[PDB]
mmCIF file of C-alpha atoms in Angstrom:
data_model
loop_
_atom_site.group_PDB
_atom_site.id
_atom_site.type_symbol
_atom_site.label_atom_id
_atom_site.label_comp_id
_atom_site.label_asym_id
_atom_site.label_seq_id
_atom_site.Cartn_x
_atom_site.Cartn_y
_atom_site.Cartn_z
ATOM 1 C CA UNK O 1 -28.846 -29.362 -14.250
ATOM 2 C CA UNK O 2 -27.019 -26.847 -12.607
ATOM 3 C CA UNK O 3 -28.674 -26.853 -9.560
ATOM 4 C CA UNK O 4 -27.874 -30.751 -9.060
ATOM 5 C CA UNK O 5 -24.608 -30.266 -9.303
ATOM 6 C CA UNK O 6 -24.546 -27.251 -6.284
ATOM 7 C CA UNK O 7 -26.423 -29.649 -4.553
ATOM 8 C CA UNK O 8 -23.730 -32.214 -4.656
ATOM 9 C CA UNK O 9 -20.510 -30.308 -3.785
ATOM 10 C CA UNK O 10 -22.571 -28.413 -1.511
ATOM 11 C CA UNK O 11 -23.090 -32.018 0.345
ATOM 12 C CA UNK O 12 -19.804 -33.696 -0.022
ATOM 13 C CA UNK O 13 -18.482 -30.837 1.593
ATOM 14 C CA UNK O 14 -20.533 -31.037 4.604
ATOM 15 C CA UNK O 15 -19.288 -33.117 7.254
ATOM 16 C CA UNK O 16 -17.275 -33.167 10.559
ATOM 17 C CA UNK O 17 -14.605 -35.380 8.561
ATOM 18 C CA UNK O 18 -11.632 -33.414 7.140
ATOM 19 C CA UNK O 19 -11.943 -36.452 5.095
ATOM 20 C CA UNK O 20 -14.663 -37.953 2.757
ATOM 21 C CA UNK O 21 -15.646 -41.732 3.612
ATOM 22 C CA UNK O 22 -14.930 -44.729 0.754
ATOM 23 C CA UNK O 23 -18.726 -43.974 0.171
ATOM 24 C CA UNK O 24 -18.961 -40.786 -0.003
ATOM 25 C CA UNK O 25 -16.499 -40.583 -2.479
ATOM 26 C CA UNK O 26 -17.579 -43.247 -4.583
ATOM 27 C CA UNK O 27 -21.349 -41.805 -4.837
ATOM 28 C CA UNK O 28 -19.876 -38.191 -5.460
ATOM 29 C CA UNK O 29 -17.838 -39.419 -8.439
ATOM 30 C CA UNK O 30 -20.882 -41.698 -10.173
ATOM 31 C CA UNK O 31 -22.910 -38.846 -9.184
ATOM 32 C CA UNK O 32 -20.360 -36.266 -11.111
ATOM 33 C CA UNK O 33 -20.614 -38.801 -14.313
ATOM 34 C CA UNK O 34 -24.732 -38.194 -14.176
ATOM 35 C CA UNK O 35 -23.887 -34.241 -14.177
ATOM 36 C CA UNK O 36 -21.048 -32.044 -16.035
ATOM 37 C CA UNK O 37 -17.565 -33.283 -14.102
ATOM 38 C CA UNK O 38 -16.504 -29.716 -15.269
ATOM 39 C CA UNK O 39 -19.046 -27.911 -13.763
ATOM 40 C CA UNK O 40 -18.421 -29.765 -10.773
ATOM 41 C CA UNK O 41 -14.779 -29.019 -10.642
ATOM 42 C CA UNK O 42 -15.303 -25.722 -10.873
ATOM 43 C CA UNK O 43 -17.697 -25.544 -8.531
ATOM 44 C CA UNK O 44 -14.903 -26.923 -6.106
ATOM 45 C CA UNK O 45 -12.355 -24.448 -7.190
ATOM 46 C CA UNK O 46 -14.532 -21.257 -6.221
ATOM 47 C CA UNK O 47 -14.987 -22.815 -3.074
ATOM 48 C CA UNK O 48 -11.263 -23.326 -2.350
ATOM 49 C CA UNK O 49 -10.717 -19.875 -3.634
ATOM 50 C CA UNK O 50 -13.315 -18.217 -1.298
ATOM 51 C CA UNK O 51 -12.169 -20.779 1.519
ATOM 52 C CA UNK O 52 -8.503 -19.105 0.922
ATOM 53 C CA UNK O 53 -10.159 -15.693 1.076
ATOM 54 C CA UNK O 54 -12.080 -16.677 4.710
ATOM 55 C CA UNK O 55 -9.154 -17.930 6.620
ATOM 56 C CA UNK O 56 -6.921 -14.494 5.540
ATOM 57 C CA UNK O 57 -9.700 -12.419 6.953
ATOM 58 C CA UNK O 58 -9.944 -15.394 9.822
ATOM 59 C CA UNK O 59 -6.357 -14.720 10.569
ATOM 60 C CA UNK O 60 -6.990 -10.947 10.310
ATOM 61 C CA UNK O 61 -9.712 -10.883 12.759
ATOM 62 C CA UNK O 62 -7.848 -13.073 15.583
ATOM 63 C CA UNK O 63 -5.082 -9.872 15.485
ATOM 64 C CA UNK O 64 -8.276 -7.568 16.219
ATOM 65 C CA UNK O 65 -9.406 -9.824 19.365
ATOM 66 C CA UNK O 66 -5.961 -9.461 20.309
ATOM 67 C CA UNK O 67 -5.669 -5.921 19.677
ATOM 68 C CA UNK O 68 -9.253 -4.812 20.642
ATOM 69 C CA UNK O 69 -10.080 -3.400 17.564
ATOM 70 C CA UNK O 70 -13.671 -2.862 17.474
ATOM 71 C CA UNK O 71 -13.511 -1.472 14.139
ATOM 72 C CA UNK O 72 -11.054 -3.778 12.650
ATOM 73 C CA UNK O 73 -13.568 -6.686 13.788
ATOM 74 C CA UNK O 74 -16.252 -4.977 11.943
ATOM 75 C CA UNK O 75 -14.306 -4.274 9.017
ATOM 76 C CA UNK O 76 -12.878 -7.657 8.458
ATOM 77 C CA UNK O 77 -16.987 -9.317 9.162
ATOM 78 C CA UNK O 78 -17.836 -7.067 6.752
ATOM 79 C CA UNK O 79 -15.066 -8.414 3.944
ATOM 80 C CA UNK O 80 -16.349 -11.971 4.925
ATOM 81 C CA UNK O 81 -19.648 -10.681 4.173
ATOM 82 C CA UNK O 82 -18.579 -9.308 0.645
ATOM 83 C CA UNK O 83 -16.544 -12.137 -0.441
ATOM 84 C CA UNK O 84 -18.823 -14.815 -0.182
ATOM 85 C CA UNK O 85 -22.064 -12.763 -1.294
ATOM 86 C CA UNK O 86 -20.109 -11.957 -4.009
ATOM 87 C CA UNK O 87 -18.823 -15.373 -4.947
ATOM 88 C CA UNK O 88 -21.629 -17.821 -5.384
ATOM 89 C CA UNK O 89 -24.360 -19.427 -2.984
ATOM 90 C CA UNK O 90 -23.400 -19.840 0.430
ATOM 91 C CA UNK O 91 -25.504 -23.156 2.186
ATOM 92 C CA UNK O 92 -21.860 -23.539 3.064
ATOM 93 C CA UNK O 93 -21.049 -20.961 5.072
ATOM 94 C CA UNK O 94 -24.330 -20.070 5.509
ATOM 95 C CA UNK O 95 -23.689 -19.814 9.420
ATOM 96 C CA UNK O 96 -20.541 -17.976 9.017
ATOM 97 C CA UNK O 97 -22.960 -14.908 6.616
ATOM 98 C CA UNK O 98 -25.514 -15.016 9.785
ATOM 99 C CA UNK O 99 -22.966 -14.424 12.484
ATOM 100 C CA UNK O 100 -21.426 -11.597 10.337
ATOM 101 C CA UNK O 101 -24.387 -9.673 8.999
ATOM 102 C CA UNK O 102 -25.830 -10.008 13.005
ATOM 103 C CA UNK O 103 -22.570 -8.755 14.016
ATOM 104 C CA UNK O 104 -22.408 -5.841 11.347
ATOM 105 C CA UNK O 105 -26.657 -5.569 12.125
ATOM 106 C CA UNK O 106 -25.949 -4.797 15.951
ATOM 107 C CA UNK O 107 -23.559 -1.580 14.481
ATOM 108 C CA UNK O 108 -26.825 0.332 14.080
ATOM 109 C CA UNK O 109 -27.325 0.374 17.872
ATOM 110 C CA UNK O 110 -24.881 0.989 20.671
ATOM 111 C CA UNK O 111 -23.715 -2.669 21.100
ATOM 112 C CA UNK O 112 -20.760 -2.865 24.116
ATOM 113 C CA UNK O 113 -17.110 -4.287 23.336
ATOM 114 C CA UNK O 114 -17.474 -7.482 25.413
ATOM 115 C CA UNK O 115 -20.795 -8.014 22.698
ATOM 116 C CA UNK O 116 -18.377 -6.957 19.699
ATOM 117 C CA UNK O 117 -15.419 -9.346 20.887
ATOM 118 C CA UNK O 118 -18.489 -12.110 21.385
ATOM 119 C CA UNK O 119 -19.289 -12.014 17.596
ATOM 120 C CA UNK O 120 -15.404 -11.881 16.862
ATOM 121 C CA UNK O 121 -14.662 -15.283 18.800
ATOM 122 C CA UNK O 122 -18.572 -16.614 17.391
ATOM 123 C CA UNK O 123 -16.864 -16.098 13.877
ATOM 124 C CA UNK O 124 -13.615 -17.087 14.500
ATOM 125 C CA UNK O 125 -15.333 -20.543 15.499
ATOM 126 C CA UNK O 126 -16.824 -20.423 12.576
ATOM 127 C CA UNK O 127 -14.243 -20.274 10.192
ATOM 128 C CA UNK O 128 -12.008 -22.716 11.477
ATOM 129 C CA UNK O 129 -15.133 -25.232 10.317
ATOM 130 C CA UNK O 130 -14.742 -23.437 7.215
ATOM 131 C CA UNK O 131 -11.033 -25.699 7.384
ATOM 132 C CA UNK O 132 -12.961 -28.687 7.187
ATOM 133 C CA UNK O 133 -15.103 -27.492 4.206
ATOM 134 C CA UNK O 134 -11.942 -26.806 2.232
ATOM 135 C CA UNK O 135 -10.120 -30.235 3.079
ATOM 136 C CA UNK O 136 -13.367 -31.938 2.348
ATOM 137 C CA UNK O 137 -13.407 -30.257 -1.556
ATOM 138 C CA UNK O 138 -9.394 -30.842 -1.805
ATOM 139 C CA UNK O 139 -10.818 -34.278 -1.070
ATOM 140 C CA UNK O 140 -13.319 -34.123 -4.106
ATOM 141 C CA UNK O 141 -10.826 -32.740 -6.452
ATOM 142 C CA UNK O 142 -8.604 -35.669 -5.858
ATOM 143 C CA UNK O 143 -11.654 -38.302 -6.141
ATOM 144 C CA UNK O 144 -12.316 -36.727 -9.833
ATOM 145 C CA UNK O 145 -8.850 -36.227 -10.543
ATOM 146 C CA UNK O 146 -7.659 -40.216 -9.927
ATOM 147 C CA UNK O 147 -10.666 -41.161 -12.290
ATOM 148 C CA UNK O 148 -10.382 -41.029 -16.162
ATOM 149 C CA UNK O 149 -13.764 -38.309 -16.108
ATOM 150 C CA UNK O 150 -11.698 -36.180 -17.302
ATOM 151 C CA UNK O 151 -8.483 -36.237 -19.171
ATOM 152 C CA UNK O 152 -5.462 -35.869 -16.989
ATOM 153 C CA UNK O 153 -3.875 -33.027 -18.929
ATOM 154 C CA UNK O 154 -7.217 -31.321 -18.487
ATOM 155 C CA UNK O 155 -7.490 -31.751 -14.710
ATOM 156 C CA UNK O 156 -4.367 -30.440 -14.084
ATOM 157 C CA UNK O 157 -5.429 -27.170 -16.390
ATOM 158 C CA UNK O 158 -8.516 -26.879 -14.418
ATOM 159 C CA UNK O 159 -6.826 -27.115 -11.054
ATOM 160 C CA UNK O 160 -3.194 -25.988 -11.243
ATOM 161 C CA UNK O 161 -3.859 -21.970 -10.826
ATOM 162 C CA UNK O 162 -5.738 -22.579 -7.801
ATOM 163 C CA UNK O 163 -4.012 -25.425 -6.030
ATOM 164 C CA UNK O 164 -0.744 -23.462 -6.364
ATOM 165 C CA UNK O 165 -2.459 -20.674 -4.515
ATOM 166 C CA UNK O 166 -2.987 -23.109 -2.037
ATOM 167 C CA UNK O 167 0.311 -24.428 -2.050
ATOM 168 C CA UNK O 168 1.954 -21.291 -1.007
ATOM 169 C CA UNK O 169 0.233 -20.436 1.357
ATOM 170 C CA UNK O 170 0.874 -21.161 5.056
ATOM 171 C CA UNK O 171 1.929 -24.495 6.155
ATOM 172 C CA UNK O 172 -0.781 -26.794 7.582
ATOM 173 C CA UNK O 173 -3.084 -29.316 6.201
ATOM 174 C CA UNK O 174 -4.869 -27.372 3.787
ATOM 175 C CA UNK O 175 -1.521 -26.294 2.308
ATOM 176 C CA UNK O 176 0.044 -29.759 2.217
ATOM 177 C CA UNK O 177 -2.839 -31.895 0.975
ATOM 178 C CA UNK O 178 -2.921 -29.254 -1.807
ATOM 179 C CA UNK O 179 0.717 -29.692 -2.350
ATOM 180 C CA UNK O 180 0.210 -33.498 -2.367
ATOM 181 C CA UNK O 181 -2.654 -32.904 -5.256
ATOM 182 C CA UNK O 182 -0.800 -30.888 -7.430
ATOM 183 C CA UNK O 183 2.308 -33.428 -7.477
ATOM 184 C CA UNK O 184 0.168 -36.289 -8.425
ATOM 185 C CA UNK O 185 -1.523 -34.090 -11.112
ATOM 186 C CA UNK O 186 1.706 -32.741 -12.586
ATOM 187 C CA UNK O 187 3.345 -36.056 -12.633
ATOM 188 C CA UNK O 188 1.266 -38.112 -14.179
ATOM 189 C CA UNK O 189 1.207 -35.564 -16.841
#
Protein backbone atom coordinates (compact mmCIF):
# COMPACT_ATOMS: atom_id res chain seq x y z
CA UNK A 1 0.00 0.00 0.00
CA UNK A 2 1.11 3.26 -0.70
CA UNK A 3 0.40 4.76 2.34
CA UNK A 4 2.68 2.09 4.27
CA UNK A 5 5.36 2.88 2.49
CA UNK A 6 5.06 7.04 3.35
CA UNK A 7 4.70 5.84 6.62
CA UNK A 8 8.03 4.19 6.66
CA UNK A 9 10.42 6.75 5.07
CA UNK A 10 8.45 9.24 6.77
CA UNK A 11 9.78 7.37 10.16
CA UNK A 12 13.25 6.37 9.32
CA UNK A 13 13.78 9.80 8.64
CA UNK A 14 12.77 11.07 11.91
CA UNK A 15 15.32 11.17 14.44
CA UNK A 16 17.96 13.39 16.18
CA UNK A 17 20.67 10.91 14.59
CA UNK A 18 22.25 12.13 11.32
CA UNK A 19 22.58 8.47 11.33
CA UNK A 20 20.12 5.46 11.38
CA UNK A 21 20.86 2.80 14.26
CA UNK A 22 21.89 -1.13 13.20
CA UNK A 23 18.07 -1.50 13.97
CA UNK A 24 16.64 0.89 12.39
CA UNK A 25 18.15 0.01 9.36
CA UNK A 26 17.64 -3.51 9.47
CA UNK A 27 13.67 -3.14 10.14
CA UNK A 28 13.49 -0.39 7.31
CA UNK A 29 15.03 -2.77 4.76
CA UNK A 30 12.71 -6.10 5.78
CA UNK A 31 10.09 -3.59 6.01
CA UNK A 32 10.93 -2.24 2.22
CA UNK A 33 10.84 -6.17 1.08
CA UNK A 34 6.97 -6.29 2.60
CA UNK A 35 6.26 -3.01 0.35
CA UNK A 36 7.52 -1.88 -3.32
CA UNK A 37 11.58 -1.16 -2.68
CA UNK A 38 10.92 1.17 -5.74
CA UNK A 39 8.35 3.06 -4.39
CA UNK A 40 10.34 3.44 -1.45
CA UNK A 41 13.36 4.71 -3.22
CA UNK A 42 11.61 7.11 -4.77
CA UNK A 43 9.99 8.22 -2.05
CA UNK A 44 13.61 9.01 -0.68
CA UNK A 45 14.70 10.76 -3.76
CA UNK A 46 11.81 13.50 -3.65
CA UNK A 47 12.77 14.03 -0.28
CA UNK A 48 16.47 14.66 -1.02
CA UNK A 49 15.36 16.74 -3.90
CA UNK A 50 13.00 18.99 -1.82
CA UNK A 51 15.68 18.80 1.12
CA UNK A 52 18.19 20.38 -1.67
CA UNK A 53 15.49 22.91 -2.51
CA UNK A 54 15.04 23.93 1.57
CA UNK A 55 18.60 24.54 2.43
CA UNK A 56 19.05 27.01 -0.98
CA UNK A 57 16.15 29.02 0.26
CA UNK A 58 17.75 28.29 4.01
CA UNK A 59 20.90 29.86 2.77
CA UNK A 60 18.87 32.60 1.02
CA UNK A 61 17.03 33.63 4.01
CA UNK A 62 20.21 33.85 6.47
CA UNK A 63 21.47 36.79 3.70
CA UNK A 64 17.95 38.53 4.49
CA UNK A 65 18.56 38.38 8.47
CA UNK A 66 21.74 39.80 7.59
CA UNK A 67 20.53 42.29 5.28
CA UNK A 68 17.16 43.14 6.98
CA UNK A 69 15.13 42.32 4.27
CA UNK A 70 11.69 42.10 5.43
CA UNK A 71 10.49 41.29 2.12
CA UNK A 72 13.17 38.99 1.06
CA UNK A 73 12.28 36.93 4.38
CA UNK A 74 8.78 36.76 3.25
CA UNK A 75 9.53 35.93 -0.15
CA UNK A 76 11.92 33.16 0.45
CA UNK A 77 9.04 31.57 3.50
CA UNK A 78 6.84 31.81 0.91
CA UNK A 79 9.12 29.56 -1.76
CA UNK A 80 9.53 27.09 1.24
CA UNK A 81 5.91 27.13 1.41
CA UNK A 82 5.48 26.34 -2.42
CA UNK A 83 8.08 23.79 -2.74
CA UNK A 84 7.10 21.44 -0.31
CA UNK A 85 3.16 21.88 -0.81
CA UNK A 86 3.93 21.26 -4.10
CA UNK A 87 6.11 18.21 -3.71
CA UNK A 88 4.40 15.54 -1.71
CA UNK A 89 3.15 15.22 2.05
CA UNK A 90 5.01 17.05 4.49
CA UNK A 91 4.80 15.09 8.31
CA UNK A 92 8.42 15.90 7.66
CA UNK A 93 8.69 19.26 7.63
CA UNK A 94 5.54 19.68 8.90
CA UNK A 95 7.00 22.27 11.53
CA UNK A 96 9.03 24.02 9.03
CA UNK A 97 5.13 24.65 6.70
CA UNK A 98 3.68 25.99 10.26
CA UNK A 99 6.41 28.47 11.00
CA UNK A 100 6.21 29.71 7.35
CA UNK A 101 2.51 29.97 6.62
CA UNK A 102 2.34 31.80 10.47
CA UNK A 103 5.05 33.93 9.29
CA UNK A 104 3.45 34.71 5.76
CA UNK A 105 -0.26 34.68 7.99
CA UNK A 106 1.04 37.64 10.28
CA UNK A 107 1.62 39.74 6.61
CA UNK A 108 -2.11 40.48 6.73
CA UNK A 109 -1.62 42.65 9.85
CA UNK A 110 1.04 45.18 10.70
CA UNK A 111 3.54 42.71 12.30
CA UNK A 112 7.01 44.81 13.50
CA UNK A 113 10.61 43.83 12.07
CA UNK A 114 11.99 42.44 15.36
CA UNK A 115 8.53 39.89 14.90
CA UNK A 116 9.56 39.37 11.07
CA UNK A 117 13.38 38.66 11.91
CA UNK A 118 11.79 36.25 14.90
CA UNK A 119 10.09 33.98 12.26
CA UNK A 120 13.33 34.29 10.02
CA UNK A 121 15.74 32.85 12.85
CA UNK A 122 12.38 30.32 14.02
CA UNK A 123 12.84 28.96 10.35
CA UNK A 124 16.27 29.08 9.96
CA UNK A 125 16.26 26.63 13.11
CA UNK A 126 14.15 24.77 11.41
CA UNK A 127 15.81 23.92 8.43
CA UNK A 128 19.03 23.10 9.67
CA UNK A 129 16.88 19.91 11.28
CA UNK A 130 15.79 19.59 7.86
CA UNK A 131 19.99 18.50 7.54
CA UNK A 132 19.32 15.69 9.63
CA UNK A 133 16.22 14.55 7.64
CA UNK A 134 18.30 14.46 4.47
CA UNK A 135 21.41 12.53 6.02
CA UNK A 136 18.95 10.22 7.63
CA UNK A 137 17.32 9.26 3.82
CA UNK A 138 21.06 9.32 2.24
CA UNK A 139 21.24 6.78 5.06
CA UNK A 140 18.19 4.72 3.68
CA UNK A 141 19.32 4.86 0.16
CA UNK A 142 22.54 3.25 1.11
CA UNK A 143 20.72 0.48 3.43
CA UNK A 144 18.62 -0.53 0.09
CA UNK A 145 21.36 0.02 -2.13
CA UNK A 146 24.05 -2.59 -0.23
CA UNK A 147 21.12 -5.22 -0.35
CA UNK A 148 20.36 -7.33 -3.52
CA UNK A 149 16.34 -5.70 -3.39
CA UNK A 150 17.10 -4.36 -6.19
CA UNK A 151 19.53 -4.97 -8.94
CA UNK A 152 22.64 -2.90 -8.69
CA UNK A 153 22.53 -1.51 -12.21
CA UNK A 154 19.01 -0.45 -11.31
CA UNK A 155 19.87 1.37 -8.07
CA UNK A 156 22.34 3.29 -9.52
CA UNK A 157 19.60 4.37 -12.43
CA UNK A 158 17.22 5.24 -9.77
CA UNK A 159 19.67 7.30 -7.76
CA UNK A 160 22.45 8.68 -9.95
CA UNK A 161 20.47 12.01 -11.29
CA UNK A 162 19.77 12.98 -7.88
CA UNK A 163 22.81 12.04 -5.86
CA UNK A 164 24.93 13.95 -8.42
CA UNK A 165 22.82 16.96 -7.62
CA UNK A 166 23.87 16.39 -4.32
CA UNK A 167 27.31 15.88 -5.06
CA UNK A 168 27.87 19.25 -6.45
CA UNK A 169 26.61 21.03 -4.32
CA UNK A 170 28.38 22.72 -1.38
CA UNK A 171 30.83 20.89 0.63
CA UNK A 172 29.61 19.45 3.97
CA UNK A 173 28.14 16.25 5.07
CA UNK A 174 25.22 16.09 3.01
CA UNK A 175 27.45 16.64 -0.04
CA UNK A 176 30.11 14.09 0.91
CA UNK A 177 28.01 11.19 2.18
CA UNK A 178 26.26 11.65 -1.21
CA UNK A 179 29.54 11.59 -2.93
CA UNK A 180 30.50 8.47 -0.90
CA UNK A 181 26.99 6.78 -2.23
CA UNK A 182 27.36 7.42 -5.64
CA UNK A 183 31.07 5.89 -5.75
CA UNK A 184 29.98 2.70 -4.21
CA UNK A 185 26.98 2.60 -6.64
CA UNK A 186 29.00 3.35 -9.77
CA UNK A 187 31.68 0.96 -8.89
CA UNK A 188 30.20 -1.92 -8.23
CA UNK A 189 28.53 -1.47 -11.49
Amino acid sequence: DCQQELSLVQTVTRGSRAFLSREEAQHFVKECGLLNCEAVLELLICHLRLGMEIMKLGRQLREAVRANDVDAMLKIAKEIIKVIGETGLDEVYRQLLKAAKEFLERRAENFSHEEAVAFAQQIIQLIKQVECVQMRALGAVASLGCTDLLPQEHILLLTRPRLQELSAGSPGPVTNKATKILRHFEASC
